[PDB]
Each structure stands twice: as structure tokens, then as C-alpha cells.
Amino acid sequence: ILAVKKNPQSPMYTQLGVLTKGTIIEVNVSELGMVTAGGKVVWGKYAQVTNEPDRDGCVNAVLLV
Amino acid sequence: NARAKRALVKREAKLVENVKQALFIPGQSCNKNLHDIMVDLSALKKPDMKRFNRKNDIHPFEDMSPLEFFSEKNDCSLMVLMTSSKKRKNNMTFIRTFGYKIYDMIELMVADNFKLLSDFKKLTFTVGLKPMFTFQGAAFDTHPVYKQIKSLFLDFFRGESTDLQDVAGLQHVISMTIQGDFQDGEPLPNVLFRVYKLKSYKSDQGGKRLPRIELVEIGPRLDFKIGRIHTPSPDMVTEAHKKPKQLEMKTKKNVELDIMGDKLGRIH
Amino acid sequence: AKSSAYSSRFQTPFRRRREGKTDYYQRKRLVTQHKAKYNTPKYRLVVRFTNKDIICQIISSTITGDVVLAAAYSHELPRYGITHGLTNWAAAYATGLLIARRTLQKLGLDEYELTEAVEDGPRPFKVFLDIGLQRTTTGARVFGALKGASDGGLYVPHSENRFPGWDFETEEIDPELLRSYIFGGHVSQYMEELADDDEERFSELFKGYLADDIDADSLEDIYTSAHEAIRADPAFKPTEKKFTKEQYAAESKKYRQTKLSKEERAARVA
Amino acid sequence: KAQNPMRDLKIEKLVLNISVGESGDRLTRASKVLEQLSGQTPVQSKARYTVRTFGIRRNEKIAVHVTVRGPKAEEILERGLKVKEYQLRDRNFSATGNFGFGIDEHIDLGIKYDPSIGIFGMDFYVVMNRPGARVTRRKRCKGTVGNSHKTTKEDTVSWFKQKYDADVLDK
Amino acid sequence: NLPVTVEKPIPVVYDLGNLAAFDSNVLDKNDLDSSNARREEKIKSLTRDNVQLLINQLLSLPMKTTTESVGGTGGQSSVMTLLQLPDPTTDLPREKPLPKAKAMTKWEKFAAKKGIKPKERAGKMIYDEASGEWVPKWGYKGANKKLDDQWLVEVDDKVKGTDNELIDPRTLNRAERKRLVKKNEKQQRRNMKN
Amino acid sequence: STLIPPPSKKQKKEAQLPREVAIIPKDLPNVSIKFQALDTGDNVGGALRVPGAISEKQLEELLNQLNGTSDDPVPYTFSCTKTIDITDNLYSSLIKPGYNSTEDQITLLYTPRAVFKVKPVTRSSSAIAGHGSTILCSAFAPHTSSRMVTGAGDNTARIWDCDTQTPMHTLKGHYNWVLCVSWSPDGEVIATGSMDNTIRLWDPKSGQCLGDALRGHSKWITSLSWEPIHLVKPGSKPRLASSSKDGTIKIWDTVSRVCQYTMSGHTNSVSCVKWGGQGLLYSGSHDRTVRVWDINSQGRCINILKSHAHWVNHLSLSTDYALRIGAFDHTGKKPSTPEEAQKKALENYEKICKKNGNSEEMMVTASDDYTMFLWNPLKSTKPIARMTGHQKLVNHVAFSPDGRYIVSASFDNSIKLWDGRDGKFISTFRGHVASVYQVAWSSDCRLLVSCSKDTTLKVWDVRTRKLSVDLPGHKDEVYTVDWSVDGKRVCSGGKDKMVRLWTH
RNA sequence: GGUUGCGGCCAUAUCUACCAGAAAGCACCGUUUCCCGUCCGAUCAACUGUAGUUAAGCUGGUAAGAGCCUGACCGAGUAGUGUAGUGGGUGACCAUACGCGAAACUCAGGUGCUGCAAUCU
RNA sequence: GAGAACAGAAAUCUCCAGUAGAACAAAAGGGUAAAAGCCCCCUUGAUUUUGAUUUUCAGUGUGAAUACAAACCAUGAAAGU
């Protein structure tokens, strides 16, 4: 995980870094091998957390492509 | 309205200033030789040049307001007024302005032993690339008048500022040489202005990296006699030489940035 | 009934704007505007079409008037084997290919400058297309000449939405239609269509092909052979001059009207 | 000079104008009948000003017109001259060698009457020029025409006498 | 095979940022006066030597190469090698003075005194609960002007008893909005005067 | 975008400080040198003293004069043993670093090179459409660089004219995906092996199909190889060797359209088949073995090489460039007679085959056990060398056209460069962020091109062992890449259904 | 010397009325299936140089035409304009030395110079 | 300035002349004419996101505003804007 972009509950939770369901995070995608149309290697993108880590002990997210 | 706002934003001051524009103003009395020399200088300056065509009643050493008005209206910080008189024949007055106000003025006279750009009839360089400069004379480092001349010509013909240069763009060189070293109490020697184009050849003694250079003159060749001076006030000098420092990182003791980009602190 | 005050206050444009053949708004951006500030010189591939000729010139701007680096004309095409249609899409493609190959041979790029001291390999020759006063339309001979130069081996930055066969619905091209226009399939199809529809119209149109006994199915063959010959030998051979400079000058000044002197004019008035 | 075939005066364009004044259904029907007459869709002209007496607001539709060129224009012109029984005034021509006239009813042109159509009047105008008039129109090297080459009123009258053999009455 | 090693008595100085070379050697008036026919040769030779020194410095400067292809933003392709010019040494006067630091406005002073942090300004889209769409909170088709387009407005109880009862509430709210905008403009003009 | 750290104040002052000029001293003394051949280990002239300001061209002319071939010189490259090449001149190469002093000797290893040069491909010529599905294979014609064959997943192959970047011929005989395509080394016929277990032959000039399809394989075709021209007797056409998933290699005579031999020793799917220059065939298969068959002995397996612990994905021969090129060269000249074609093909093959004493035909096998093996099957049966270091499976392996280098492209997003004679490790090419599928040399063995899963092609300079240029433009995965014989064009194809042409 | 394409200086090049232009080029002109665009193939787009013409485009000569432009040892170092020696003058102001410095007027004149490439009976 | 039924001082069409005397902003003593004026096409993203960099804030110190730059984005055949 690189950063927390937007926690949907509140900007206070966003700046505190709370990982809840629906939170937009920034992830490192270096091992995904993404290249732009201009030849730049992509190593950072956005994902949305789709579970409750407080409930199941892990963070699952969907990459926003 | 948005276009006018964009024009105002472009005109207003900024941390990294644009290339200085030069405006060529005919005076009350003008000559074909003056027009040809102005055309050659404007060709060396373009595309940072504007040229007026009509006649203007301008006396820089008697009144500054029309020049200041022209500078503020045209957003040109360099002024070249071409005039003629019996006492001053073929007079070119270079007015460099600061904040739409007169920073400094020099007044030179062009000698008759000059050849125009079309006299040589030689192949010249591409339009709009920065030249190389050469200055010959210890008065460029010691004498205030020649200091002003050197700074004015560097600022006039410097053009775009860059930190990356294509070797295919190093075409021509402008040389300003003082006609013999002088002494105090003597008349100021004339300044000789020449323009050469480079031809590179294989050297056979500098390897394949350092070619032999040769110069072919393309004109104009000019002799400037230093007629009149007008120097700025020291507070204006300091204000014009102030630096923004917004862009550069602040220096801090015992704090460095390594090759990987990590900020590092030193311990004693 | 124009007034003398109007005559004094009149402000004429530049000469090339008066006899309108130069767009200075386009020229200033082509010459004095740069993507980067590295002082890399620019070159223009000027393409012009007359009623019977095509002019392609590679020009570098210069403070004392610009200078031509290389040029090619459509009246050199009979040398390579094109004696008909010297002003069509295929002729434009051949002219672009010819000027590209000629420039490459002149520069030695494809079979002592200051760049060779710093860089190991010569750069590809980059030019910018100059069209002057022409309409940018899908399927134009100027873009045909651009395609010819690009296939010849010059780096001309371009998109492909102006070539023939570009579909306006989906951002895609029809390379079959493009190749047909390259090798003159539209001309051959018109030839067959006229021969089947109106023999009277085909009497006037395509008369030279009938005179030389050139078939409608041989246009592709002759265009291919012309391309092969141009790629084989693209060097410039100037036309032989039957007369000389002073001969032409004297013969022209024989017909030119002689100036009358001021004293002769005063005598005529008096 | 007159023997040269390049000085012939031909039909440059025939413009048919119907100025209905009040926008709406009558304008639509005028456009429809002009379409059925000339075989081509018309072009409308926007309002230029606002006059209460004229009953026209700002930027509305006032007139339709059709520009016809070629043998179709020749056929329309000969039908119009048949309606006009081959007689025009000396004032019907202009100082630039172009001439026009009005037709009160289009039923006399040969168009079958329809009750939905109604009755429309139309202004015919014909432009005359010699070949070489595209010099003023082309994008590149737009230049003026020669003084002697310019179409004139008496030349158009002479051409009309030669072509249609109709007397141009002084009054 | 002419030499490329120009030897000079007084060592010259360079400003490679301005592409300039300055030599302060001894110049004789006799060889440079107009009475001499060899003045052109002397000046050409001196400028040639200085240009040779400057070219030596420039071609010994470090060079930047890249691997990106043509047709991309940047201007430098794989085949191009660019000299890295240092910062210019010679000082020149500016054309305009530096932009002055604007004095704090009344809002800025009040916000500093009361500890009001700047807003995050993520975007201008707000969710509408009465519908199922995201709408702009201001501007073109903004949600701040929906009362004008509202089909039915209930009349406030407090308006009754005054002569402003007959007025359209949409007109009243538009007037209040314009008054607020003009008040903001007057406050801006006041800050600029101060 | 992540930027490099900016220069500091002290670094800016250092930059503004005056620079040093690399000049050749006039008082440079002579240096004692001894020549030595990299290929043969032979010395010419012994200890000879040369000036310190000697250029590479002057040294080359002096070495030609020493050898006695001044009339017809052959350019050489020089290195000194760390081993460092001679870039511009001896002083700037060795004495300026100071590793070797003037009094010491210099042992110059000289190696022959190519007379011509290939410019790197820097831009995309065109993106040509026409294929309805993903592109699976592509090749260039050996005689000319204006003809490209490309087989795709729409059951068709296409012949493209590369001069105009337009389609020329459509080949629609097969029923399933066209897995592999190949051009005859004399340039006369294109052979396509498909997913429908069939092989077809096509005349390229007419875009036509010769006879019926070649049938007999019970599984899909994996690779096609041609009989070399220098072994083909004049007046006859070369035979076609085909491998397939069923584990059998079939030999086809195209003159009579028959099958002569059906080798069946492999217990598993045959990965690839190669027809070498000494009358042998080399087959690699998923049974972790390499089988060496003799064509002259009724297709009897001469040898079985067993040293890999996984599927051998690919194999390559030292003379593969000459075998594919036949008699043609980079100038595109065609011999007049079949006898002349056979003789010129023999000379071209021998240029790589017979050198430093005895002719050898080295083989390299890249397998799924993350390794490669370097073999000399004629002399010994044990592997000559083992190349290890890849962290994932090696998908492609290629010998350089001169045979002095090996390049391995792996699924760990890397390429590796190894010595061609002993197999020792030289360098690693990095810069791909997805798995590298295949690779292709240039004609003069100075440039390399690779295609990857990250939708990019990359051109590497072998001499400096760095990335020369990066070529994006493909919108999806690239599966095939090829470089023309004359070194003027590069073709690439993949999932985007587009053929990309690249030129200088 | 004519002409073409790209230009520099942007009226000595502009406007109005006559006259000439052999060859080449340029232009007018011919066709609407294809690419492309309009109410109109008028403009733009495509095709043939095939059917013709120099009638216009364009170039050049002419006019005490209008306009414009250039040298003056032409006004003239003149008008005007800032200091000054204690110059006078209780007075509205006056010559002088050092600086800066016009235009109107008059004479002599003019209607394009040119760079790059290609081509020409 | 002339021509065209209603239609004249004002409706709409056609031709010639037309240095801008129109319409846009500033208060030019030289703003804009194959436009900076009118119409048509494409974009609704313009409150993007990255920064060891500038200034400010914080008990939530790798966060936000802020300045500057870069990567993108829009359009165009392209130069480029």
C-alpha cells in the first residue's frame, strides 16, 4: 500500500488512514508490468477496498483499471 | 476577454522571465544606411523583434517619457532608436528598461567603413538560434563603459535561456573587440562588431572529438564609436539584480541528498 | 473616387500577401516556433501543385532568404517510366518517394559536421510538411506526396486520417483502398467504366493511353517499375540545355520592350 | 477581341428568391414548392433587423432562395421568359451586366396547382460573366478582372438580342 | 592538419551558460586601426582562436542521452545527444521587478487568528438525495439555482404581514444571491484598497 | 512521474568550474604491443612498437599490412586484457585510465567484423491492419526486405509489401490457426504449418497454393525447417522438416509432394526441429531430451542427449543465420545459376562453420529448468557447458549470426548475453517489466531486438551492453518480432491484430 | 533576359486609363466513376493536358494623373532651448561663452532591389 | 452605387467599389482582415496527480492548502497552441 486517497466515511478518517469497505487506496503495481502509451512504466494506481478487514483480518481490493 | 486576460498574465512579472523583446524605432532623421543596419540587427535578433516604420520625435537625453510609453505599450525591454545629425551621424541609441522605466542608455555612432549583410553574399545561419559570444579587451572587465557595452550586447543577443544545447545549432559567433588597449585620459577606442559562421574540419591531432574550426564572415561588420552614456542608480541596480530564490531548495547544514534521493543527516 | 488622404493613409500588406501565395500566419509558426529550446534546426517539405506539375522542395529557413536543400519535379517521371498522369495521386506518391530517396542519397543516410564529434550515428532526417494555401481534405495529393516521402525514408510526422480509405465512423483506415490509390486503381477503374459506359467520353479522356497502346491493367506494373527504378537510381541529372545563357538573354531582350530615357520622354511631351 | 471565344456571356447563376416576410407554415410551403421546382433544397436567410411594422423579430427566417447553375437553370430561365412573353425593360438590367425580374404567380410556370401549396411569387435573377471569372473566387492568387473584360449592361443587352431575339423596351 | 590547441598568455574565462568566452589579452591599436589593411585578418585570427577554445570547452562538457523514440513529448530522441550547459555566470539586469508578496487579507488574518484550515477542494460534485444523480454544487447547471426552476414553492409564514408577499420567492432568492455576490466583490475591492 | 534528484549548490559550482580538454600529448612515447587472434590464438609480428597517437583506422591498416592483405582489407575490432575494447585511440582507451603504463606491453586481441553497419530502428513505419485475429507468427523474405509473411489466428496468412506498408496477398487455405510460417532459403515458396495438423505450400508472387495440403500429422504443427541450399544438390528443391505435438518429425519432398521419413523417437511433444549444415537434424521435445538424427541414414537417431530436468523449449545452431539465408547476402543479390547459388551458399556457410582449425556446429538448448546447455554433438556426447542464472524458464535462445554470442530471453523479464564458444556469462539486459517472448539479432551482430509481454519492443546495443531504444506502440501483447536481412526493417505482431513496421 | 516554387526588405512594390508579351512556364479552360464538400463540382475534391484561347490572371512600357520614396556643403548650426563670469539695468528685458538642437522652403532625383533551386526557342 | 411583385426612408436576393470608418478589449503617440471579427467541427476533462522543492498550518509530524516544475489531457495532417 502506498497511500490512502479517500475514505468514503469522512476526510478525517481519510487523513487518519482508516481502511474500511469502499476506501480508495493507492497501490504499487510494479510487478503487474503496466506500460503507458508513451513508454512509461506504471508502478502506482488506485484500488478500492471491497471487504471489512476488521472482520476478516485482511485487506482485499479491486484495482481501478 | 479570456484572451485579454491571458495577454495580461503573459505581460505581468514572473519568477523566470521571458526572452527580452527589442523594438526598433526610427527617429526624426533617418537614412538608408540606418534602415539597412537596423534590418541586419533585427534579423540577428528575430523572432524577438518588433520594428516601427514611421518617424518619431524622440530625444532620449532630453526626455524619457515617450520611450517609457513605448516600452510599456509594446512590452519591449530593449529599445534601438536610429537617428542622424550633423554632430552625431548614424546614431544608434540603445535603451534598456527596467519595470517600464529607463534603466540605462548607451549611444553609439556607426562609422562609414561598414559593409551591410547583403554585401558579403555568403550562406548564413538558420533563423532563430542562439549565437556564441566573444569579447576582446580588458576594458570589458575593468572599464565601466565597456562593462555596460558587454552586458548590453549579451542581454540583447542572448535569446532563449536553456541548459540543453544541440550541437547542430552552434552556427554563428558574434565578436566584440576593442580597437587597441587604451590609457586614462585618452579617447575611448571604437568597438568592432563582427559576425562569423563556423566551418568544422577533421583535425588529425585532436582525434575524432575536437574538430578544427574556421570562420567565414557573414556580416554585418560595424564600428561603434561610444558617443554618450547614461548609467542607472545603485538602488535600481540592486533591484534589477535581485534573485527570486523560490525555485531552489534551501541549503541546510549537515543535510545532503544522495544519488538515490534519500535525505541524509550528518552526525559529528 | 478615392481620395489622396485615403491614398496616404493606405497600409498595404507584404508583397507575397498582395499577390497572395504565402500564408504568413502559418509561416511564422512553421519557422519561429519550437517544441523544445535546444536550438535544433528545422526543415520544411514544401509541396505545391500547378495545373500540370508537382513541386516538392526541402527548404531550410535563413535570415537572408531561405535555401533549398533538395528538390524534385514530376517532369523527371518520364525518365523513370511515367509518361502519363503527371499530376495525379500516383504521380504525387512517386514524386515524394523520389525526393525522399534523392535527399537520403545526398546525405548518405541510406547508401565534417559538428554532430559527428558527439554522436556515433547519423540522425534520421526530419522534415515538417508545408502545404501553403491548400485545403486539408481526406484523400489529397499533398498527403499522397507525404506518404511517398515517408515510404522513401524521411521522418515526416503525420497522422493517417487524411489518406484515402480512412473511415470517418471508426478511427481506422482501409489499406486496400489506400494501395489502390497508391497504384492508380481509381484511374484504371475510371478507364474501364468509361470503356463500358461511354465510348464517346473515352475518346477524349485517356486518349494518350490509346495512342501509346497502354492497357488499363498495366498501370500497376508501370508504377511498380517506376518505384523500383527510383529506388535504384535517385540521383539528379539536369536537363541538357540546347542554347546558352547569353543566347537566351539576347533572344528574350530582342522581344522585351526597351526603356525610353527621361530626355526622350521630355522631348515627346514637348 | 470579340472574335475570341473567351468573351462569350453565359448564365453564371440563376437565383430564385421568395421573401415571405412572416416566418412559419407559408415559409415552409415556399421552401417545399421551390424544392419541387428546382429539384434542389433551398437555403433560408436569417433576419437582419427588427421592425414592428414589418412584424419581424431578431434572428428569424424571412426568405428562401435557390441557386441553379447549368442546363437546369437554362430550362428554368426559358420557362420564365415564356411566361414573360419575351419583353424586358432597359432598366431591368443592371450596371454590372446582371438582370432580374419578378413573377407574381408560379402557377403560370407550369407547376400543377395544389390547395395546400397556395400561391407564391418569386424573384428571378440571372448573373452574366465571361469565362475567367474564377480569378476573383479562387483561394490562391485572387486578383481583379481586366477593365475591358468586365461584363457591361449594353453587352448583356446585345447578348440577349442574339440569344432570345426579344426586344428590350426603353420604357 | 592544423592544430586545435590554442595557447594564450593571459588565461581566458568562460560563461558556458551564455556560450561566451572572454579574453583579456593585449590588443595593439596599429593592427586594429582602419589605416591597416590586415585588421580583418588579425581580428579573424583572434576570434578563431577564441572560438576554438569555446568549442573545446563545449565539447568537453557532459552529455545527456535518452532512449525514448521519436514522436513523443520532450524533444530529445534516442539519436540526439545534448550538451549539458551549466548555469550562466554573467549577471544581467531583469526586465521587471520581482513579484511582491501580497499582504494578508481580512479573511486570511481572521482564519489565522481562529485556526481555520483551508478546505480540501476535492471536487464540485455533490450527491442529490431527492434524485439519483451527482450534480454540480455551483456554476453551469449548478444545484445552487434549482429554486428558480422549482415547480412549486411554499410561501414562508414570516413574509406575511409585509408588502413583499406578492413577490415571487424565486425572484427574492435570486436578488439575495446577487446581493451576496456584490457584497463579496465589494469586500474584494476593499481588500485590494487596503 | 518520478524524477532523478536535482543537482545541488556545490555540484552547480563544480559544473561552472572550467572543464578539462581531452587532448593527445605530442610527447607521447611508443608502446610495445603484441597481436593475438581471439578465434585462433595466433600472434602476428611479435613485439612491435607503435606511436601513442595511433588511431584505430591506422592500426587496422598496419595490421592488414602485417598480414599481407592491404589490397583487400577486412576491418577488425581490438581489445586489451578486465578486457576493454579500443574505442577511438590507444591513449584514450588504455593509457588515460592508467591501468597500463607506457613501459608495459599491450596484448591486443583482434576479431574480424562486418564490413557494413545496420542503423537502429527508432520509429514505427506504420500500423497495418488486415488480420482479423491475434498475430501468431511472422518472417521476412530472405532475398528481399520488401516481403513479409505473417500467419495469424483467423486461419490465414498474409504477404505484406513492406515498401508501401500495404497488404499484398491473402493465403486462406488452412482450417485452424496458422501456428508457424517459414520462407524457403532460395526464396521460392512459403510453408505454413497450422493448428489443423496440416502443412501448406504457397507461391508468394501469385499468392497461390501449390497442390493440396500436406497431411499425416495427428497433432498440430510446432515448427518448420528447410533443407540448406549448400547441401541441396543443384536442379532439386529443398526438403521440409516438420515437427508436431504428437511427437513425430516428418520429412516432406515438395518436388513430388511426398513424405520420405517419419522419425518417432520422442515419447512426448516435440518442441522444435532444426536442419543443420552437416546433414543432421536436431529435435527438442517435452521428454527432456534432444535427439540428433541422420538424414543420410534413413532417419536413424545418431545420438540422444539427456542433461535437462524439464522441457527443452528451444534450440539453436551457430550457423542458423547462414542456414536461413542460403546464398543471399545483405545486398540482395541473386545468383544466376543453381550451381552458383549452391557454391555461394557453401562459401557463406563455411565462413561461420570452418574457422580456427576445424569446422564445428555448436548447439544451444534452452529448457524449462531455468537453464541452457551448450553442446558440440559431432566431437563429444557430454555437454560442453551449462548456462545457469535465469530465475525463471528460458523461453528463447539465439546464436549471433557470426556465432560468437548467445542471447537467452527468459520469463523473468530479462535477457542474458553469453559467450558463444565456451558459454561463460557476459552480461544481463534489463528494462522489460514483463516476460520476454522472443528475440532477434541484426545482420552485423551489433544490435538486438526483443519483444515482450509488456507491449514493448526494445533494441539493445551488444557492444555497449545497454538499452539503445525503447519502442512502444502495441496496444496488447507482442508475440512475434523479426529483423530483415539487410537490416532496414523490423516487423512485430501480437494480440492487437496489427502488424507494426519499424525503421530507422 | 523571360518564367516557375520558396523567401528578405514590405508602396521606388499602391490605385486609375491605354499598349505589347515569339518560346517555355503560369493561368483560363474540359470531365464528375472514384476520395471529398456545398442549395449550386460556383469554391473545395478527384481525372485527362485530352477540345482551344492568350480574351482575362501575370510581367513589362506609357500619364506635365493621384499617392509614395531618396540625397543634400538647402534652410542651418537657424528658430527654439539649460548654466555662466557681478554684465548693465531700483525698472517689464537685452548681445555674449559652453551644451542640445528641429520642421516648413529650395535644388537635384526615382517607380523596385534582390537570395536559393529548376527551366526556356 | 445600381437591379429584383408585394417591399416605400427600414424586410430578402445579385454584382462592383470598399484599410477596416464594422465588432472585441484597452483608453497608442503603430491592438486585430485568409483575424484577436462571424459561422462550423472536436473536447464538458480543467477543482487531474506526482514532487526529497517554496510559504503556512497541525498534538492527526510521509497530511492539506500554497508556489513552481514535470507526467498527462484537448485539438490539429503537422508545425505547434
UniProtKB/Swiss-Prot annotation, chain A:
Disulfide cross-links: none
A single GO BP: maturation of LSU-rRNA from tricistronic rRNA transcript (SSU-rRNA, 5.8S rRNA, LSU-rRNA)
Entry keywords, A to Z: Nucleus, Ribosome biogenesis, rRNA processing
Cellular compartments per GO CC: nucleolus; nucleus; preribosome, large subunit precursor
Keyword Isomerase listed: no
Function comment: Involved in the biogenesis of the 60S ribosomal subunit. May play a part in the quality control of pre-60S particles. Under normal, rapid growth conditions, high levels of NSA2 would allow the progression of pre-60S particles through the ITS2 processing.
Subunit structure: Component of the pre-66S ribosomal particle. Interacts with NOP7 and RRP1. Interacts with RSA4 (via WD repeats).
Entry similarity comment: Belongs to the eukaryotic ribosomal protein eS8 family. Ribosome biogenesis protein NSA2 subfamily.
Miscellaneous remark of the record: Present with 8660 molecules/cell in log phase SD medium.
Protein name per its UniProtKB record: Ribosome biogenesis protein NSA2
Organism lineage string: Eukaryota, Fungi, Dikarya, Ascomycota, Saccharomycotina
Gene (UniProt): NSA2
Boundaries of the shown chain within the full protein: 197 to 261 of 261
UniProtKB/Swiss-Prot annotation, chain C:
Entry keyword set: Cytoplasm, Isopeptide bond, Nucleus, Phosphoprotein, Ribonucleoprotein, Ribosomal protein, RNA-binding, rRNA-binding, Ubl conjugation
One GO cellular component, as annotated: nucleus
Domain of life (superkingdom): Eukaryota
One annotated GO biological process: ribosomal large subunit assembly
Matches recorded under InterPro entries: Rbsml_uL18_euk (IPR005485), Ribosomal_uL18_C_euk (IPR025607)
Cross-link (Glycyl lysine isopeptide (Lys-Gly) (interchain with G-Cter in ubiquitin)): 147
Main location: cytoplasm
UniProt modified residues of type Phosphoserine: 150, 159, 218
Subcellular location: Cytoplasm; Nucleus
GO molecular function: 5S rRNA binding; structural constituent of ribosome
HAMAP family: Ribosomal_uL18_A
Subunit structure: Component of the large ribosomal subunit (LSU). Mature yeast ribosomes consist of a small (40S) and a large (60S) subunit. The 40S small subunit contains 1 molecule of ribosomal RNA (18S rRNA) and 33 different proteins (encoded by 57 genes). The large 60S subunit contains 3 rRNA molecules (25S, 5.8S and 5S rRNA) and 46 different proteins (encoded by 81 genes). Component of a hexameric 5S RNP precursor complex, composed of 5S RNA, RRS1, RPF2, RPL5, RPL11A/RPL11B and SYO1; this complex acts as a precursor for ribosome assembly.
Family: Belongs to the universal ribosomal protein uL18 family.
Function: Component of the ribosome, a large ribonucleoprotein complex responsible for the synthesis of proteins in the cell. The small ribosomal subunit (SSU) binds messenger RNAs (mRNAs) and translates the encoded message by selecting cognate aminoacyl-transfer RNA (tRNA) molecules. The large subunit (LSU) contains the ribosomal catalytic site termed the peptidyl transferase center (PTC), which catalyzes the formation of peptide bonds, thereby polymerizing the amino acids delivered by tRNAs into a polypeptide chain.
Protein name: Large ribosomal subunit protein uL18
From Swiss-Prot, chain D:
Residue numbers carrying N6,N6,N6-trimethyllysine: 72
InterPro entries, per the entry: Ribosomal_uL5, Ribosomal_uL5_C, Ribosomal_uL5_CS, Ribosomal_uL5_dom_sf, Ribosomal_uL5_N
Record bears the keyword ATP-binding: no
Domain of life, source organism: Eukaryota
Broad class of where this protein is predominantly found: cytoplasm
Gene3D superfamilies: 3.30.1440.10
GO cellular-component term (any): cytosolic large ribosomal subunit
GO molecular function, one term: structural constituent of ribosome
Record localization: Cytoplasm; Nucleus
Post-translational modification: N-terminally acetylated by acetyltransferase NatA.
Keyword terms: Acetylation, Cytoplasm, Methylation, Nucleus, Ribonucleoprotein, Ribosomal protein, RNA-binding, rRNA-binding
BP-aspect Gene Ontology terms: cytoplasmic translation; ribosomal large subunit assembly; translation
Note: Present with 39000 molecules/cell in log phase SD medium.
Function, in words: Component of the ribosome, a large ribonucleoprotein complex responsible for the synthesis of proteins in the cell. The small ribosomal subunit (SSU) binds messenger RNAs (mRNAs) and translates the encoded message by selecting cognate aminoacyl-transfer RNA (tRNA) molecules. The large subunit (LSU) contains the ribosomal catalytic site termed the peptidyl transferase center (PTC), which catalyzes the formation of peptide bonds, thereby polymerizing the amino acids delivered by tRNAs into a polypeptide chain.
Assembly behavior: Component of the large ribosomal subunit (LSU). Mature yeast ribosomes consist of a small (40S) and a large (60S) subunit. The 40S small subunit contains 1 molecule of ribosomal RNA (18S rRNA) and 33 different proteins (encoded by 57 genes). The large 60S subunit contains 3 rRNA molecules (25S, 5.8S and 5S rRNA) and 46 different proteins (encoded by 81 genes). Component of a hexameric 5S RNP precursor complex, composed of 5S RNA, RRS1, RPF2, RPL5, RPL11A/RPL11B and SYO1; this complex acts as a precursor for ribosome assembly.
Family that this chain belongs to: Belongs to the universal ribosomal protein uL5 family.
PANTHER family on file: 60S RIBOSOMAL PROTEIN L11-RELATED
Protein name: Large ribosomal subunit protein uL5A
